[PDB]
Amino acid sequence: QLLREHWVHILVPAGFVFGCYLDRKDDEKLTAFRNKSMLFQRELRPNEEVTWK
Amino acid sequence: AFCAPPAYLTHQQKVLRLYKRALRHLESWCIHRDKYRYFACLMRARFEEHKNEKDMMRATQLLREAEEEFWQNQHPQPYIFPDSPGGTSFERYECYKVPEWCLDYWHPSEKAMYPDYFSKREQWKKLRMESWDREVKQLQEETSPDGIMTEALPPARREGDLPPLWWHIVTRPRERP
Amino acid sequence: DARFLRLMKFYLMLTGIPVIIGITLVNIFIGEAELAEIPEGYIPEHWEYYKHPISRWIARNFY
Amino acid sequence: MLKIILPSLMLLPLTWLSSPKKTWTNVTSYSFLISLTSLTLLWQTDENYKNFSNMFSSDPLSTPLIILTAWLLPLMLMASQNHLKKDNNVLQKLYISMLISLQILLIMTFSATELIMFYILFEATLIPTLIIITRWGNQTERLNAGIYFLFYTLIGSIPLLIALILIQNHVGTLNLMILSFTTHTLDASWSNNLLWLACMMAFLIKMPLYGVHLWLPKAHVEAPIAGSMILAAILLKLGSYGMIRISIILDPLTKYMAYPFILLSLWGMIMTSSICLRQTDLKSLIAYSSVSHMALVIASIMIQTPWSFMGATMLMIAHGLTSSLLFCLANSNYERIHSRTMIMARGLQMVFPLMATWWLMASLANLALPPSINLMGELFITMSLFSWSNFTIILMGINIIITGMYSMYMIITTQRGKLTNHMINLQPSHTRELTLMALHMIPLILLTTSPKLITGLTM
Amino acid sequence: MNIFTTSILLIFILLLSPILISMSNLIKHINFPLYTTTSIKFSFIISLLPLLMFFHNNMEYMITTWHWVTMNSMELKMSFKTDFFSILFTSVALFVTWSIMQFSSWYMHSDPNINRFIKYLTLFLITMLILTSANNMFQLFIGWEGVGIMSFLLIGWWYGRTDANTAALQAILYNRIGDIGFILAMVWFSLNMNSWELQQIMFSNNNDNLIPLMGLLIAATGKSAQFGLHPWLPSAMEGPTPVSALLHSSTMVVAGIFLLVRFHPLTTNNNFILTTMLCLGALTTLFTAICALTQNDIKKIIAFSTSSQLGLMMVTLGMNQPHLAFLHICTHAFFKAMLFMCSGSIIHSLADEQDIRKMGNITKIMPFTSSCLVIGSLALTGMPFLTGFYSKDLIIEAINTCNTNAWALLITLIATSMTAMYSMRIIYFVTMTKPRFPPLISINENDPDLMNPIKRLAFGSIFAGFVISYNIPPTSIPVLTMPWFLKTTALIISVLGFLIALELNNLTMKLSMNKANPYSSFSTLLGFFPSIIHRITPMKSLNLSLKTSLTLLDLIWLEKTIPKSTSTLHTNMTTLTTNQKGLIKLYFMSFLINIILIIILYSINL
Amino acid sequence: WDKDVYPEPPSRTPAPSPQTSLPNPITYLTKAYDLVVDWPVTLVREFIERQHAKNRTYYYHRQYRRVPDITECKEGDVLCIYEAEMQWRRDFKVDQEIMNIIQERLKACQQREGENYQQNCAKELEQFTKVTKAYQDRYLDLGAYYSARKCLAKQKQRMLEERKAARQ
Amino acid sequence: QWQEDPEPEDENVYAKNPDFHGYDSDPVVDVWNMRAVFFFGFSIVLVFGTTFVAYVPDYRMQEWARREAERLVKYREVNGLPIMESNYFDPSKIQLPED
Ligand SMILES: CCCCCCCCCCCCO[C@@H]1O[C@H](CO)[C@@H](O[C@H]2O[C@H](CO)[C@@H](O)[C@H](O)[C@H]2O)[C@H](O)[C@H]1O
């Protein structure tokens, strides 16, 4: 099969996918002040959970 | 441009050059043709007045005096032939004198547009290829035994042989391409 | 030289022309949003502060 | 930022796992796509700078440099595709790995939040660049050039390490946001002056100041084309970026500690620009042009007005692109005539008519053609310095004249004049070279359309 | 108003059309020169309309097209300032460029790359129009510097000529030395007024405005070739004759005068500036008229005539007469372009000869060209009621009846007469004496692409002066009361110069040798300014750059001081320390010294 | 076009008042331009505006609630100092735009008045001068690293100077 | 002399494969590489990158700045206030050092 060497094409896009996931994790850890900042603090709208998730 | 300068010049060459330069400057000074003729005849009279001087020391002194007078009286802005060095359009066409070795890089599709010319060119390249060996040997054999050399090159002596070092002399771009 | 120019023009147009066509169609039909005062009692979405439809689409789907 | 770093790292596995045939194509393509991905950092619709995590951040000052770095790597690969034509596969892949590593480290450096990130990722650039110069260079003196390049920077850097450690001991941290938001005034003690110097000297050396600029004319005329491109497109700007980020703490000492370096910059600019007039090496001429431009950048940064900062950033980017293009062009002619003398090859407009067009455009960018961002930067720096002291216009004008002069001198000497007809080996321009020049010019034209992107933090 | 602004923008769009067509494959399939000529014709026709609107209601517009960037409280908008100056000059420039672009096809039929030549001429036209219709100082700079680049490319179009390459770099030198002053003006008007827009700059009338107006004067000197930076224009004729006709006479060189006219409101108060301009204009007029005489090249004579005319405009501005100076700009554009075209016709018909010594009897052989040349000369030396007279006469009137530097006035009048003298030089040696050209006559001017353009410019030279003068709105109160001699001073001096020139030229047929003369040499060699400056300044500067900078300091002293000193010292120290004889006796002796030193340190430190 | 923020005096065009038998070319050129160019262009524009009426959408100008100034921040409290600093930056650039608007007013006034600008633009020149004095006293001599704290320090220096002058 | 290879003779790459795009010896790899370069660079990064950058909205919220400035100016002009007060920080807030 030509996958023999066309498998290599999945590395870089996998790099992008993995980087995006890790960015989401990085933003997860920094949750405090999620909605506790003077400018932007608000009461959540009805039927809502997280402001910026 | 077609002959190499000598090691030096004799009195004859120097005086002739001075004659030509002075006549042209005299013309540049005297715009009208009749006036130019009037004064050029006097100039030839002066030049020939000392034509036969067999004391070369006095001859050289006379020539030096003539040259200094020339430098004193030279037209500040002389007449320059359009193609002559220092004249407008001296090198005006050197942009388009692209050489012949460029054609070797033409794409075959470009060569297709001109079929016959390139066939003739191929003949010419074949001729040059053949003649190089003989012409190099010719120069090597015609080299002077002594250590005295001149720029002037030899002619074709044998039969069916191209003149030595001819590719650059021939094939040079046309004056007005 | 001619080949380079020709290929460059072709490959720039390949996506330029479709993209300019898309921009023109969006501008002519979809149109640009217009300023309004926030309806009191409403929490506008983050994208809803951008004028252009393309800008707001990108905002909503990717920022 | 980790959506840009990780693909860059993954380029390396691709480079080494690709088949020998498709390696160049695959890495070039995926590097272009990484460049595309890097544009996400331009979605700054608010004044709050981006901070992607505790480690990586971006700003108006760092986004343009990061995007430039991403853009350069594909062009570096294209420029290197040729002179590596007949090397063994592992050696070619080593070169490609070196370039990828350089991109990774430079992006991380520009996106670093703590100055002791920056001090490590900044000097880590020395290894790949040193290898590129010394291993793949042509002439013999490349070893000496590598030694100069390494040690000038290391001597500059060690005092930076000492100063940074002192800073951390005194403040408690080295996160640049925290330093900015808790800075305090320095006092004019001798120890504080020594600090100021320790903080500023490494960056000033990397921004070769007139007296410490001997490592550029060597590194460049001994380095291959890709080395020269990355060097005098990004490495030289490391110094400016460091200076901009770090000067915030070092106040108010600057008011009188800048007189020496402002003077050295404003004089060495004239001296080097003049040197460009009578230099017989095209690579050297370009290098000294770069030195003059960085002299301007240093003067503006060391006067610190809003115009100074914004124009310095604009000119940083503009010089990056323009010098890169000039070096690619010179390497184009070098790959054929195998010489670096400017006099040797002449009248090449008679055989490379389009590359002559690219030459002309590059020379215009160099000489600062309005409305080009090159001019905009130089003009705004000039306005700043004139405000600082109305007499600097004399030096600025002399430098402008000489800049135009050597910029046109290159063109007249090479492109114009009788074709050196004896050059049989001159071959038609490669589509690779033409595309490389186009990729250098087009970003310049688009940014001239949209200058707002490349302004600094101030404006 | 829609029509006016729409037409203004459409002019530029039309002028860009040939460029875009050039960057396409349709250039091969179309007759590009004719397409560009047609575009220029249509652009001129469009421009006529805004001119009519202005002549009617005299309403001037500030049109802001695109917002290029905002720089912390200094927007940069692509602005256009349409008014008397801009509108009339756009009309005139388009007319003259229409004529010269049609004539370029004839003069350059044989040459390849004719398409590139036409493209470059068009590009110049766009850039100069940007200069004229510019509100921002930055945009005005775009025009200022882009016309400089186009001049570089057109001069030395034949990049084979080393001489033409030097001429292009000469132009860049002098223009950039000028542009230093322009950048100074920009920076000053940015710091002190915080805006590059002319409307906002106007409110600086109550400041000193010396530091900026000096920059403006220097930039104008450089670009318009006033005395200080004059050599570039006369030797800018190495380029093609159409380029000389258009750029370096009719349109480009008027850039400095145009800039000063634009900034007339600020310079009204600064007497120092006005007197400086008066003196500079007078000096340039006299100097370049002296050089104009005793010059044997048909194109260089006209080049020096152009420099003299520009010096006259400088005087016109030196006295507070901006409108009249601009009127002279526009009026002279016509007949200067016509004279250049006639000279080009002569040069082409003869074997590319440009010396007026190898031209003669042209009036008999080329009736059309000689007739138009005579019209051009009579316009240059304003004969009553031709285009020149409807400007130059009023200029001289104001000069003779305004408080002025006495010397400046005198040399200006002498140069006015001397213009007649050198115009006679041409009309004589090129059209009146018996032939001098090579025998093989091959003269054809019957080509319509040559006849019609020159016809149009001759009709311009014969009527446009009166039409413009009568239609333009009142601006400056002219002085009309004066003595008889002052009133007819210009005519008497011009006619006297003509007669003197006729006497002198007729004296040449006398069968006597003309001898080298100090004044003749001073005139012919161009005052020695080239020979001296262009041989001392480049040499000194370049020698310093190689020796003091590159060699003495950069390649020698810096290397010795910083790298090599360190390298030496460290090598000295390694050769001092490492070389040990390798004997345990000596090594343990050193260990003993360490013993003693530690003991001593312990003891003293306690 | 909010005429308030962008004041624009009224138009006062005069009567045709023709006194010539000849026809004015401008009126006929304008009629031809109207009919030929304006009419089709207006048709196109009306079609686009109908297409916009369909698919109408709204965008809202963002409102930023006020937060404590740097004066209310305890030294070294980065958490509050960040918010105070960002607020100051936004106010800074809003002031920049104020200056731009007033400068545009001045330029438009100059162009409108023409040669009467030396008298009829006095009002806008006065407004420009006052606002530029305010801008200078607010943000000038602040380094490229301008910040709320530098602005506060500058203001306090000037207030100390004024207090001294009042005392003396 | 030491045993070292002679310097290689120069090459003309247009002698073979007259359609040399400058990228590789093999014509197939060469053309595919050129296509990849042009496509991913010009037909992607430049075009899509330029469109994205062009349609980034409210960059550094400049338009928001202008809109808010217009609103504030209208407010101040209607209410009669000075457009800008020379004191950014209200002096009442500041506890100016007492002597
Ligand atoms: C302010 C602090 C920053 C400044 C720091 C400067 C440190 C720079 C150190 C550079 C050291 C390079 O060391 C370099 O060694 C090479 C060996 O090939 C020497 O090379 C040379 O040596 C001698 C000349 O003295 C010759 O005989 C020899 O043939 C030649 O190669 C260089 O002359 C020296 O410069």
Ligand SMILES: CCCCCCCCCCCCO[C@@H]1O[C@H](CO)[C@@H](O[C@H]2O[C@H](CO)[C@@H](O)[C@H](O)[C@H]2O)[C@H](O)[C@H]1O
């Ligand atoms: C403050 C500390 C800073 C340290 C950073 C600087 C590092 C300095 C490196 C010192 C070593 C450089 O090493 C350098 O070697 C070269 C040859 O290689 C020596 O140069 C040598 O060249 C040849 C022999 O090779 C001899 O003809 C010459 O006389 C001799 O000097 C240099 O004199 C020496 O300086």
